[model samples]
Target: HMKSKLPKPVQDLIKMIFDVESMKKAMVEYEIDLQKMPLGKLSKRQIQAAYSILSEVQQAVSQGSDSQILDLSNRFYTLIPHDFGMKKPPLLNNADSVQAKAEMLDNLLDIEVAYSLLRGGSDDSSKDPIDVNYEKLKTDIKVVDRDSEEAEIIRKYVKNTHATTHNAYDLEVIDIFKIEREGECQRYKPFKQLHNRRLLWHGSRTTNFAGILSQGLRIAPPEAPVTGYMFGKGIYFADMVSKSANYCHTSQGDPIGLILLGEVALGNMYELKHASHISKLPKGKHSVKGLGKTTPDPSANISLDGVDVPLGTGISSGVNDTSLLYNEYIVYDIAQVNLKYLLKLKFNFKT
Candidate 1:
């Protein structure tokens, strides 16, 4: 196995995050310290040590290490139940939403990893596969003496680049969808045509209103109820409420979105149809780096802009994809329970 050495500071940070005993000790120490002194009174070194573990994990994620990715994903789910104040037996209705919330946290973690890598000389442009072939380059590196400084730099550069590029592309693609469908509202339109003649059938035909009602009953299903309510003064009400309700409410049938993370192979490209459970969401909100709230602190991560700037609503707005509303509700039988409860299950991990 090729040895990858993380910077000493980064290694210390990763250990702090992964070792539960260490983390608990540190937390206790910090809590005790906070009682005696204002948090702001701490020096940068003290503060840095506290947060270093997560930053290191984020860096590992940015480097696209499989071990690190799996570790982060697993640990994240374990943290969610405690974070959300969920009890042993979750509320049913909110389960699905809770699961989605956990997924979003995983995504946020990935995003933080990306940001950490970026801060350490990993640039999206530099990692472009077209610029260099990483597979062939890795093969070349294996022949070099492992302890050489040159080999060390090359390994760091490659690992960092691979992670950053993978994450950047995924983020960019998802962002495109978000921009296309932001704050979109649904409009209902009818398919009707105007006829010039009121029809001789009205007069000539034995105008039995009974036959007309019976014929209409033949086509509509039993469960479907048709009722009509007019909104404001000007609009006329149509009693065909069932048809409208079926389309408006998703309980009857609605599809959920699923996004596949990590890499994809070329020759084995999969087809995406209604059956293909494939969809994408913004990395900003879903990435582990996010606070896992709709609103995230902009100053927490580096700004998209080159200069130092504040993070705010723009990040939330940028990450919110209106297309997500399509099947926002969970189907009844699949989880029979509600979205929130489902989320608690999903985010709770082994717990």
Candidate 2:
């Protein structure tokens, strides 16, 4: 049934053109300038244009139109670098249909490469290390339960810590700021009590899994401590420290600007254990199925009014709902709400 959606040849063409590694290989073989147009990761427009041309060429091939093929071939060639070295498919009579179709496919590869090179790369790694070596940092991190009133104490502790450290370094707290989710806006306030400041962070809730970097960059100052509440899948945080270094960028350079100074959990946290399906989850507990056993630990903690709560914990038990099973071990075992601060660090891209 699935195969009926598109003809076999069209499906095959789509698969070949969409392969990420194949596109990367074409960029490398064609000697496309990476710095100018990082073909390894393409932009939205480039990807769209590529698929557009691919569908057009596929349709032309399907119709067996020789004039359309030649004309499209020339149009496709214009999308790639001039020195790409691949000749256009010969006219219909000069080349067999099979050979012509193959050549058209090859041209699609060049078009994909050109799209990547022309539009500029994803530009995801231009910031400074906000949380470099987060694994190591996790070992020493202090987590606090956000649902508990004590969470405020932890926030105060962080604020005090930053104040003392910055005072010692003679770096006056320039401004307090937070990242707004509505329009990706950054709001700032004059120096004030840390407890009174709005949570200037984001998580998966308001932001896309891949958008954390841009959100962070948009809110963080060049060299100041930022505070906020951000929620997202735990796996995203893992990649934030790993793959992000390669993709997240700004005008300054890779990692944009801002080094992770510290992170503190401000709410109840949970560890993902084995589970069969969503229906099997106990009341008050949440789980995302299909993650399997390989799901990252430190799962997203249950939150209330932006604060995290222990597993099977909620504001109040209602009809048909029993009191939360308050197990100290599980409560402490789960991850806690967290706060991460990026140091004002800037770097230049290598010429």
Candidate 3:
């Protein structure tokens, strides 16, 4: 047997090199590929061990030892190509070179194994060839935005739905009306205009006919209904009386604007609520409420129109009002429902 031909030192060296436990420990400790590891990274003791093993291998080769140990030593040398006074070999230039080398080695190994198997003479028989359609072999092909009726339909649908419109706030007209009655009114008109307009104006309220006129005139009427007192001239008197009686008011329909406003308001409310809390603690304990606190500071105050207000009052009031408007009056949902309902009603009438 080949085992009896090998020396004790050669056997021990082979065993150490092929030790699975040692290889695993080295891999885990270094976190690198053992095959590609640099010899400099290894400990002095390990380096000496490798050198002794390689020296014994070279000695065995010089003595013409025709054994598996010689073959193993050649494979080990390939792994540590730059070790034991050996120069680093030139790397393969590209993937093709690597692949070609790998294929050549595989073919050589296969031939060696086949020759050994044939020499032994196997009893196992080879299977007959199975028929296959080479032409029927297929590859998956995906084409996006193909010129078809369905594609055209989808394109048209998206284009129609995503059509842009002017923002209600963007449509705001800054009117400078010349008051023929009073020169003093003209002097304070700019200041009055500035005071009436808020920093964050509501699109739904600001885009109305009355709201538009309010930018130019002092006596612009409220959009909602009101009561009592009428002492003014011309357009001012007409606006006051009309607004109070809630007459001749035009219906506004900007579903997109209203939806956008509601979404923005909801987002702002979410940020405000999340950023700080309302606290009821007294004196020094009542620090301004903020995020990442165990408890809210109850002493935290809210303001509206320069007056102290409830913490959640502004947010809560808007929530109910917006919800009611969205559900009941907003044309977005109501228009769809009305269209379907009215169509059904018309069908029933015809029937």
Candidate 4:
């Protein structure tokens, strides 16, 4: 059987020097700037052990006992926490060893701060409203059954064309774009036909459904092709109105910028980069299809590519002939994503 783990005293000592709070506090209190801090700080707790290890290391160095020095160094390494507050030191060089120790200590401290800071909310009010909310339509639209030809067509379209669902994180279709026709007079339609665009991005992970934001792609304007070929690998939140909180920027604190639509042509892209630390624009642009369109109460027919296709009403092509290009837009969900690995980072240090 394996021997019992190291005693609590040894572990506690190791933790006291290497843990984030302890190491960071020590570094800060000592006025050890990241650049000036020495490697000796890493061995403060294990000075006696470090001395013994160093002697062995010196002997190994003289004898060119690479394995011996490595073993001795590793023993000390194991005694200390991996996440100290500085860069890691190689086993061979004394200075490297010191630097490594300091770096590890610094890393532990950095992680502690990173977690605390990341968990803290920005002081921007507009960021308060960056939430993702999805509401099951009170009345689900009647779609052709999955086994039916119509459903088959839709399924194929969504799968093959990326038209129905490409990189969309979350989707919503309003009965009316304006609040004037609220309640019974609301006309609901599938989002694709209604918007005439697709929200495209990268990942397919859909964890954290409630009040969580996800990641996606963000396109840019026609004038700036290079800058326009960008995407947002950021967070989003899910929310609902009345039932859920509304997305607001200034609600939390100050804002970077206000969310606004571009005055350019229909296919023009929209993006929110460093706008407000707290606020964000919906990631993608509006589709060629203008808001307020709805599926026909009875579906209509249209000839596309010489093939008769059943289409929805309210969804109309614009006179400028720009409606055909509406499919070139992306949608951004209202939620943000949480990255776990990024939460608690670690590092090493040297004197």
Best by TM-score: 2
lDDT of 1 at 179: 9
Candidate that beats the other on TM-score, 1 or 2, i.e. the better one: 2
Error of 3 at 331 (Å): 30
Query: What would the per-residue lDDT of candidate 3 be over residues 38-116, giving only the tens digit for each residue?
Result: 3224343333343344434434443443454545455434543332335433333332322333222222222222223
Q: TM-score for all predictions?
A: 0.18, 0.25, 0.13, 0.21
Cα lDDT of candidate 2 equals: 0.29
Which segments of candidate 4 are over 4 A away from where they belong? 1-144, 162-203, 210-229, 232-328, 331-351
Number of the top-ranking candidate, with lDDT as the measure: 2
Which pairs of residues have clashing backbones in candidate 3? 279-297, 279-298, 279-299, 280-297, 280-298
121: Cα error in model 3, Å: 99
Q: What TM-score does structure 3 among the candidates reach?
A: 0.13
lDDT of 1 by residue, 19-84 (tens): 334323323332222233222232333323323333334445335455445554444333332222
lDDT of 2 by residue, 281-308 (tens): 2444332212111111224233334433
- After superposition on all CA atoms, what RMSD does each candidate show versus the true structure? 28.3, 21.0, 38.1, 22.5
Task: Please give the distance, in angstroms, between residue 229's alpha carbon in candidate 3 and its true position after superposition.
Answer: 12
